[PDB]
């Protein structure tokens, strides 16, 4: 009956990471940035709009009900705990404007989430697309543009889900600009490319990690100022091991065990500077986790939102942009010159804010 906000934070992040694994499997050798927490948060909003079997499919996948006493407040709390000027987010559901909505739903949604279900006239397609893109752009400090692309919606669209995040955290200890140098990055297909790489000598939190098959990985922690967020960087020791070996067994809990086993070793780290932007179409990932009804006409149950007309999700999309740089203000080597996993984590709650694979910086 009573659960500390860490409970939902782990379920949310666990589910978010499972969605990431589906995305990572679908884009084997491409860059991906993604927010496990972001997709959990927006799917929690979608739980409230849905009914019956559509709702159950989402609850079975996420492992909790947004209706339950304690949940809505805990998420609200979590959001406050997590979130500035280096991080900005927005969650939004847009539904066709003249559709009769269930009595009391909009105030009820607002009470549980402190944001509104947006109403728009999709039959004026470009106006509708502009309004949605303007909402997203203005609630990510102008960093996420054109989230909803030309052709993504049309005259017959009735419901659209949107999630967007921008991250540009500044590391606690900066990389000296003068040590930034061009160096060969080895891509998964055997080819190389010369890219700007940062270098820093320091005592880094570090652990080795060995999978059940015997291959091992270097895992470094790079704290951010604020002493609460950290980026974890992970790559196989051997050049020939694919990064998917790691991503196919990733969990929120595994990452906590990594942190648990770390000690501060003195190392020269060489890490590529990168700036990645990705739009994930969430449909196939979520379908693969059992949430199939919501995307299907005359199957989806959105009777909590409207019990007047049928409804289904036309688009569920996340767009994230992450930037990693020297972070400046006013000895054995670890070289990340091969594809690597990164994880941005909030260490008190264990929340996974961001996850990605850098296949080519």
């Amino acid at each position, epitope marked *: 009956v009573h659960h500390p906000p860490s409970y939902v934070a782990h379920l949310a992040s666990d589910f978010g990471v499972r969605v990431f694994q589906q995305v990572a499997q679908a884009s084997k050798d491409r860059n991906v940035v993604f927010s496990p927490y972001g997709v959990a948060s927006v799917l929690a909003m979608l739980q409230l709009t849905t009914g019956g079997e559509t709702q159950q499919q989402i609850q079975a996948a996420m492992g909790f009900k947004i209706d339950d006493k304690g949940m809505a407040p805990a998420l609200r709390h979590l959001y406050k705990e997590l979130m500035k000027d280096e991080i900005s987010t927005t969650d939004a559901i847009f539904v066709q404007r003249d559709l009769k909505l269930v009595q009391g739903f909009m105030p009820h949604f607002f009470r549980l989430f402190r944001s509104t279900v947006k109403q728009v006239d999709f039959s004026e397609v470009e106006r509708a697309r502009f309004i949605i893109n303007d909402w997203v752009k203005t609630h990510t400090k102008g960093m996420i543009s054109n989230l909803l692309g030309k052709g993504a919606v049309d005259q017959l669209t009735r419901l659209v889900l949107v999630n967007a995040l921008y991250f540009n955290g500044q590391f606690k200890t900066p990389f000296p600009d003068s040590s930034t140098h061009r160096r060969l990055f080895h891509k998964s297909d055997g080819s190389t490319v010369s890219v700007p790489m940062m270098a820093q000598t320091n005592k880094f939190n570090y652990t080795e990690f060995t999978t059940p098959d015997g291959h091992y990985y270097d895992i470094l922690e790079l704290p951010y100022h604020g002493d609460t967020l950290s980026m974890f960087i992970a790559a196989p020791y051997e050049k020939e091991v694919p990064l998917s070996a790691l991503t196919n067994i990733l969990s929120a809990q595994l990452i906590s065990h990594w942190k648990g086993n770390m000690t501060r070793l003195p190392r020269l780290l060489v890490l590529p500077k990168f700036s990645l932007e990705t739009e994930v179409d969430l449909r196939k990932p979520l379908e693969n986790l059992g949430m199939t009804d919501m995307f299907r*006409q*005359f199957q989806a*149950d959105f*009777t909590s939102l409207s019990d007047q*007309e049928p409804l289904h999700v036309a688009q569920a999309l996340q767009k994230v942009k992450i930037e990693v740089n020297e972070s400046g203000t006013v000895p054995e080597e670890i070289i990340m010159d091969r594809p690597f996993l990164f994880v941005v984590r909030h260490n008190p709650t264990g929340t996974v804010l961001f996850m990605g694979q850098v296949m080519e910086p």
Partner: nanobody, 119 residues
Framework: VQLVESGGGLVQAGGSLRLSCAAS????????IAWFRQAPGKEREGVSC????????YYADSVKGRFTISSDNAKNTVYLQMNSLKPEDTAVYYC??????????????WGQGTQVTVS
């Protein structure tokens, strides 16, 4: 409680077909009513819906303008008028009824399905 489709068959592209579904053991109009179809190599998909909330008709994007769904209360019969048929409309068409204000899973009753082949 029975749902029996009929009116299926063979027609060339551009022609018309009228499917029917006759219910016994219940009254259609009380229910939300849908037609679905499963074409070769594809999953079963919604085609059309009459929502019991207010009797309004809705259609899948690919059939809107060509297909009409209707209900004859006196006959306890539901129809799907299919006009301007394309080869992509070839499928086994199912009628379903559900005790709800709008068409949505799970459905209470399905018919056996009737073959429509558009050459």
């Amino acid at each position: 409680v029975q749902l029996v489709e009929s009116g299926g068959g063979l027609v060339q592209a551009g022609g018309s077909l009228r499917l029917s579904c006759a219910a016994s053991g219940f009254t259609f109009d009380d229910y939300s009513i849908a037609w679905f179809r499963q074409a070769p190599g594809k999953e079963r998909e919604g085609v059309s819906c009459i929502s019991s909330s207010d009797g309004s008709a809705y259609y899948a994007d690919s059939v809107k303008g060509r297909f009409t769904i209707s209900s004859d209360n006196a006959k306890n019969t539901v129809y799907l008028q299919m006009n301007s048929l394309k080869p992509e409309d070839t499928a086994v068409y199912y009628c379903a009824a559900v005790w709800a204000r709008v068409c949505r899973n799970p459905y209470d009753y399905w018919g056996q399905g009737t073959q429509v082949t558009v050459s």
